[PDB]
Amino acid sequence: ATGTAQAVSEPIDVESHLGSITPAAGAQGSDDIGYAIVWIKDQVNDVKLKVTLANAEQLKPYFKYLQIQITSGYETNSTALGNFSETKAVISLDNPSAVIVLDKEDIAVLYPDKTGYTNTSIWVPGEPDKIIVYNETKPVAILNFKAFYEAKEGMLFDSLPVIFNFQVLQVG
Numbered sequence: 001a002t003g004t005a006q007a008v009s010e011p012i013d014v015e016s017h018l019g020s021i022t023p024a025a026g027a028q029g030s031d032d033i034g035y036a037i038v039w040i041k042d043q044v045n046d047v048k049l050k051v052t053l054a055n056a057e058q059l060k061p062y063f064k065y066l067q068i069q070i071t072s073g074y075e076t077n078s079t080a081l082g083n084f085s086e087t088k089a090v091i092s093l094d095n096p097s098a099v100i101v102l103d104k105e106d107i108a109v110l111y112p113d114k115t116g117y118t119n120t121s122i123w124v125p126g127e128p129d130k131i132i133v134y135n136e137t138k139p140v141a142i143l144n145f146k147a148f149y150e151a152k153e154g155m156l157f158d159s160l161p162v163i164f165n166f167q168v169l170q171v172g
Contacts, residue, residue, distance in 0.1 A: 004167070010168070011041065011171075012038060012039060012040065012041070012047075012171070013037075013038070013039035014036060014037065014038060014039075014166060015036065015037035015039070016034070016036055016164060016166075017034045017035040017036065017037065018033070018034040018161065018162045018163070018164065019031070019032055019033050019034045019162060020159040020160055020161045020162060021033070021059060021063075021147070021149065021159055021160040021162065022159045023062075023151040023157065024151075027150075028149075028150035029149075029150075030146060030147065030148045030149075031146070031147055031149075032127075032144070032145070032146055032147070033068060033145045033146065033147040033162045034145050034162055034164070035124055035130070035142060035143055035144045035145060036049075036051075036142070036143040036145070036164070036166070037132065037140055037141070037142055037143075038102060038140060038141035038142070038143070039138070039140050040107055040139040040140055040141065042139065043104070043107070043139065044102075044104060044107055044139075044141075044172070045104050045172065046101060046102060046103065046104065046172070047101070047102040047141065047171060048099060048100065048101055048102075048168070048169035048170045048171070049099075049100040049102070049143075049166060049167075049168065049169070050097060050098065050099050050100065050166070050167045050169055051070060051089075051091065051097065051098060051100060051145075051164055051165065051166060052091075052096050052097035052098075052164070052165040052167070053068065053091060053093075053096040053097075053162075053163070053164060053165070054096075054163050054164070054165045055160075055161070055162060055163030055164075056093055056096050058160070058163075059160035059162075060093060061155075062151060062152055062155040062157040062160075063093075063149050063150065063151055063152055064149070064150045064151070064152040064153075065092070065093060065148075065149060065150065066092065066093050066147055066148070066149040067090060067091075067092045067093075067147065067148035067149065068090065068091045068092065068145055068146070068147045068148070069087055069089075069090040069091075069145065069146045069147075069148070070087065070088050070089045070090065070091070070098070070100055070143055070144070070145055071085055071086065071087050071088070071125060071143070071144040071145075071146065072085075072086060072087075072088045072100075072102060072103070072106045072141070072142070072143055072144070073085035073086060073106070073124075073125045073142070073144065074106075074108065074122055074123070074124075074125065074132075074142060075122070075123050075124065075125050075126070075127075075128065076116075076120060076121070076122050076123075077117075077120055077121065078116035078117055078120050080115070080116045081109075081115075081116050083125075084105070084106075085125040088100050088101060088102075088143075097165075099169065100143065102141045102143075106141055107139050107140075107141055108122065108133075108137075108138075108139050108140060108141075109139070110137040110138075110139065111137065114137075119134075119135055120134075121133070121134040121135075122134075124142055124144050125144060126144075145164075147162075
């Protein structure tokens with residue numbers, strides 16, 4: 001039922017890349033709240049990960065609504081490898097938790113020959129500056145999170161740090 005971090009680290013590694021929310025003066029917008037990295041020791045078939053916004057109640061009082069979309073994918077300079085971006089799940093203040101399913105195709109592939117030109121980089125979709133791996137090949141899965149929100153009128157507030165919760169549902 002419950003048991004997070006009890007005996008030694010898990011066979012897989014998770015890296016939470018979190019960003020904060022800032023109000024903008026105009027009408028409404030969307031911003032990247034952060035991303036998550038799944039370090040695969042060696043070729044995986046699938047992975048189930050549930051994400052739940054634990055800090056929602058904390059930042060909810062000054063917003064009208066918050067919608068967080070989870071995207072699985074990659075970006076590279078070499079089009080020959082052909083990447084793909086697809087939304088796996090969208091959570092909201094009404095649905096703080098959702099199930100995430102990673103595909104083997106989402107897992108990066110290593111090339112002993114390094115086809116597609118050497119010395120290339122891989123980054124989160126839409127962000128070339130968000131380089132995950134450069135001049136190195138290791139299978140990992142990246143999950144991007146985009147938030148949809150509008151600050152409620154009349155409230156003065158500072159930036160909100162984002163907190164996400166992860167619970168392993170099943171592996172392999």
